[PDB]
């Protein structure tokens, strides 16, 4: 049985990843000393809540409020919350055309809540990671894997209608789902994900191909960050960020010689994620969600979490998601 510590851990890990990754976003190369300096300063900062969250958390909050209000999953409700959240705080960091989806949802001219997303990228749909960045809560609320898959997909399709976008969301949700189930071995976890993605996807199995590359990298020694960036990616594309977040989580189950030992696994996961550069708040928010689900609140340290905008509201929302989970059993 999943614990409240795991549900809260996952949401706080997501929040930490967003808030701490945000300042580094877009850096083609990050200097790890800069990340470690930032962490040391953060820990000494007298004022609380100085790190603002981005679109990743804004949309996460909307997902959660929808699930709490409509526990059987209501995509119409969820789309409305996405669009209303954007309208309230439009400058949180939305990109890759996604605001056109919200503007169409807000207009009276669209009645099918999936149609705006289908029109993106000249009718091909978005393959960005915005579906995946906000999906962890689906795995926290719904214990049944079939529900996780179908609701991860539908929640993602509200904005991301390309199979790369929505299958990236499914993969992220599945990573959280399997991380909740207890102590894991890396290869077994990867086979769990590969087995599901083979069926879901089946160039033909792009996520499966990246997961197999992860397995190869974990079996290798001394893997430079540059090889991870080159082969898995650090981009806004779901295919170039969801596997990278999974790799970051699995890598950080063990010590990293470049990250001081005083950091716990979850802290290491966030630091390592950010150190890969690129889309740092989304890769760290996704890796942090998985790590939080796995290690729980015990590794969410006071000095880190107090730095984040909306930490109190996040911790409270976990209790309501946990209640949903319990009702599902
Ligand atoms: Mg963001």
Swiss-Prot record:
- Which cellular component terms (GO) are annotated to the entry? chromosome; mitochondrial matrix; nucleus
Q: Where does Mg(2+) 2 bind?
A: 25, 279, 281-282
EC no. given is 3.5.1.-, 3.2.1.143, 3.2.2.-
Report the domain of life of the source organism: Eukaryota
Task: Print the keywords alphabetically.
Answer: Chromosome, Cytoplasm, DNA damage, DNA repair, Hydrolase, Magnesium, Metal-binding, Mitochondrion, Nucleus
Q: Which residues bind substrate?
A: 55, 124-130, 160, 236
Record text on cofactor binding: Binds 2 magnesium ions per subunit.
Stated regulation of activity: The protein undergoes a dramatic conformational switch from closed to open states upon substrate-binding, which enables specific substrate recognition for the 1''-O-linkage. The glutamate flap (Glu-25) blocks substrate entrance to Mg(2+) in the unliganded closed state. In presence of substrate, Glu-25 is ejected from the active site: this closed-to-open transition significantly widens the substrate-binding channel and precisely positions the scissile 1''-O-linkage for cleavage while securing tightly 2'- and 3'-hydroxyls of ADP-ribose. Activity is inhibited by calcium.
Chain positions of site Glutamate flap? 25
Reactions it catalyzes = [(1''->2')-ADP-alpha-D-ribose](n) + H2O = [(1''->2')-ADP-alpha-D-ribose](n-1) + ADP-D-ribose; 1''-O-acetyl-ADP-alpha-D-ribose + H2O = ADP-D-ribose + acetate + H(+); O-(ADP-D-ribosyl)-L-seryl-[protein] + H2O = ADP-D-ribose + L-seryl-[protein]; alpha-NAD(+) + H2O = ADP-D-ribose + nicotinamide + H(+)
* Its job: ADP-ribosylhydrolase that preferentially hydrolyzes the scissile alpha-O-linkage attached to the anomeric C1'' position of ADP-ribose and acts on different substrates, such as proteins ADP-ribosylated on serine and threonine, free poly(ADP-ribose) and O-acetyl-ADP-D-ribose. Specifically acts as a serine mono-ADP-ribosylhydrolase by mediating the removal of mono-ADP-ribose attached to serine residues on proteins, thereby playing a key role in DNA damage response. Serine ADP-ribosylation of proteins constitutes the primary form of ADP-ribosylation of proteins in response to DNA damage.
PANTHER family, from UniProt? ADP-RIBOSYLGLYCOHYDROLASE, ADP-RIBOSYLHYDROLASE ARH3
The molecule here is called: ADP-ribosylhydrolase ARH3
Species of provenance = Latimeria chalumnae (Coelacanth)
